[PDB]
Structure formats: C-alpha cells, structure tokens
Write a structure and sequence with these properties.
Plays a role in nitrite reduction. This protein has one domain. The chain contains seven helices and no strands. The protein starts with a helix and ends in a 13-residue tail after the last helix. It has 142 residues and is mainly α. Bound molecules: heme C (5 copies). One heme C (HEC) binds next to helix 2 and helix 3.
C-alpha cells in the first residue's frame, strides 16, 4: 500500500482519497490510483514547504503546472464531450477551483442545471471586482 507511507503523517479522512478516484483504475498501469499519481513525491525537505509535491488550488504553482498533472490520465477531447467549458479553462484556471476530489462527493457532479451556470457568474464576477484574484487559487466555490 504505497499510500500508507503518506498516511503515516497525513489524515486518512480529510487527506485520504474518498472521492471517485478511490475506486478507479489508473489507465497508465492498471493499478489503483495512488497519492503520488496526482501529487508526485516528497523530498527530504518536504515538511519545510518546498516545490516537491504538487498542490492544487493553492498559489505555489502556475495554473498550467497544476492542470497538466490531470492530463497524465485524462483526455482533453473527452473532457469537451462531457462539459464544453473545459477547453477554454485548461490553461486559465486551476481544475480544483471547480472540482473537489478528496471528499465523498464532488461539488461539480451534484450541481443543478442552474448551478452549472451560476459558477460562471460567480467566478467571472469575482475577476471583475477582486483585485487579488489569482487563477491558481480560487476559494470562491468552496
Ligand atoms: C511526514 C514525515 C510526512 C509524510 C511521510 C508525508 N507528508 Fe506531506 N506534508 C507533511 C507536512 C508537515 C506538510 C506541510 C508542509 C508545509 O507546506 O508547511 C505536508 C504537506 C503536504 C502537501 C501540501 C498540503 C498543503 O498544506 O497545501 C501535500 C499535497 C502532501 N504533503 C502530500 C504528501 C504525499 C503525496 C505524501 C506521500 C508520497 C506525503 N505528503 C507524505 C508531512 C508528511
Ligand atoms: C490517473 C492516475 C488520474 C489522474 C492523475 C487524475 N484522474 Fe481523474 N479519473 C481517473 C479515472 C480512471 C477516472 C474514471 C473515469 C475515466 O476517465 O476513466 C477519473 C474520474 C474523474 C472525474 C469524474 C468522477 C465521476 O464523477 O465519475 C473527475 C471530475 C476527475 N477524474 C477529475 C480529475 C482532476 C481534476 C484531476 C487532476 C487534479 C484528475 N482527475 C487526475 C484517473 C485520473
Ligand atoms: C468549472 C468551470 C470547471 C472547471 C474549471 C473544470 N471542470 Fe471538469 N467538470 C465540471 C462540471 C460541471 C462537470 C460535470 C459535467 C456533467 O455534465 O456532469 C465536469 C466533469 C469533469 C470530468 C468527468 C467527465 C465525464 O466523463 O463524466 C472530468 C474527468 C473533469 N471534469 C476533469 C477536469 C479537468 C482535468 C479540469 C482542469 C483541466 C477540469 N475538469 C476543470 C466543471 C469544471
Ligand atoms: C487526484 C485524483 C488526487 C489523488 C489520488 C490524491 N490527491 Fe490530494 N489533492 C488533490 C486535489 C485536486 C486537492 C485539492 C482539494 C480537493 O479535494 O480537490 C488535493 C488536496 C490534498 C491535500 C491538501 C488538503 C487541504 O489543504 O485541504 C493534501 C494534504 C493531500 N491532497 C494529500 C493527499 C494524500 C495523502 C493522498 C493519498 C491518500 C492524495 N492526496 C491523493 C488531488 C489528489
Ligand atoms: C474560476 C473559478 C472560473 C469559473 C468557475 C469559470 N471561469 Fe471562465 N475563465 C476563468 C479565467 C481565469 C479565464 C481566463 C480569462 C482571461 O483573461 O484569459 C476564463 C475564461 C473564460 C472564457 C474565455 C474564452 C476565450 O476568450 O478564449 C470563457 C468563454 C469562459 N471563461 C466561460 C466560462 C463559463 C461558461 C463558465 C461556467 C461553466 C466559466 N467560465 C466558469 C475563470 C473561471
């Protein structure tokens, strides 16, 4: 269990993977998805706050760096078929500004029809009125 190493320090509930990715198979190796598949690997300096592991929806990494990890498994063509606005956001805002992957359910998969339009308004309006908007880290929808 390669996840057990992380869970020696991290909280198995809130920092455990309890969303859909807990039950999926990694298309690259046909094994269960592990922590490092999304976060990469800690260095000896990990506890100090260094650019070792990936951090999602936080200011440390550029949008392109954050989102590229998802694309080690996901396919841009298929994302379009699921939800058109994906393409224009792939390089522009953190995937995790919308998706929540650690909890038992993802906020995006439960949105009503109205909610799927309100997210556009909420974040685009924030960009117009918030001088400190940072596309790498948006707490708005959380
Ligand atoms: C203790 C020896 C740890 C082990 C083993 C792992 N993690 Fe860790 N992690 C630890 C600390 C004390 C911190 C805080 C560092 C800081 O920024 O001040 C972290 C941080 C993370 C994060 C970032 C969370 C955040 O605050 O934004 C992630 C995503 C993370 N750690 C992941 C992670 C993974 C994938 C691990 C196994 C490969 C792992 N950690 C092990 C402590 C320790
Ligand atoms: C492989 C190690 C993956 C990485 C890295 C990421 N995802 Fe993933 N995800 C993966 C699989 C095999 C599946 C099942 C569907 C499929 O494409 O085969 C998923 C599923 C999702 C979903 C949908 C969950 C649902 O409600 O059905 C979402 C929203 C999703 N994934 C998002 C996502 C994001 C934002 C990622 C980077 C932070 C990411 N995934 C990485 C495999 C893998
Ligand atoms: C809000 C504007 C979003 C951002 C930014 C990202 N995603 Fe998304 N995604 C969003 C919604 C509302 C949905 C549900 C679509 C539906 O009709 O139910 C999704 C879906 C996905 C999926 C699942 C697709 C499927 O086959 O069912 C995946 C794998 C996914 N999203 C991944 C993903 C990635 C990798 C993103 C950053 C590049 C990303 N999403 C951003 C809303 C939003
Ligand atoms: C993608 C499929 C992931 C896998 C597998 C793991 N993590 Fe993750 N992590 C991912 C995202 C998109 C986020 C942002 C929040 C969200 O739920 O969407 C995170 C967050 C973390 C954090 C920070 C938690 C916080 O500050 O609230 C930590 C410490 C963390 N992740 C660690 C971690 C561990 C130990 C994992 C294996 C059990 C693990 N992650 C898997 C994406 C994904
Ligand atoms: C942050 C949490 C966002 C949410 C939710 C949505 N959008 Fe967005 N969008 C966001 C950023 C940071 C940018 C880049 C702005 C820039 O100046 O480059 C965008 C961009 C768009 C675009 C641009 C298309 C283009 O001219 O190429 C469109 C058409 C767009 N966004 C639409 C859109 C929709 C329909 C959303 C709800 C599903 C939505 N956005 C949500 C940030 C965020």
């Amino acid at each position: 269990n390669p996840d057990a190493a992380c869970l020696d320090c991290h909280k198995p509930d809130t920092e455990g993977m309890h969303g859909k990715h807990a039950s999926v198979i990694n298309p690259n190796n046909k094994l269960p998805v592990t922590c490092t598949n999304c976060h990469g690997q800690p260095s000896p300096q990990h506890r100090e706050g260094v650019k070792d592991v990936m951090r999602f929806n936080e200011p440390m990494y550029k949008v392109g760096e954050q989102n590229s990890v998802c694309m080690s498994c996901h396919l841009p063509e298929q994302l379009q078929k699921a939800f058109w606005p994906h393409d224009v956001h792939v390089t522009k805002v953190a995937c995790a500004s919308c998706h929540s992957l650690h909890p038992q359910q993802d906020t995006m998969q439960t949105l009503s029809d109205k909610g799927r339009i309100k997210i556009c308004v909420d974040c685009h309006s924030d960009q117009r009125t918030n001088p400190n908007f940072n596309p790498a880290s948006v707490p708005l929808l959380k």
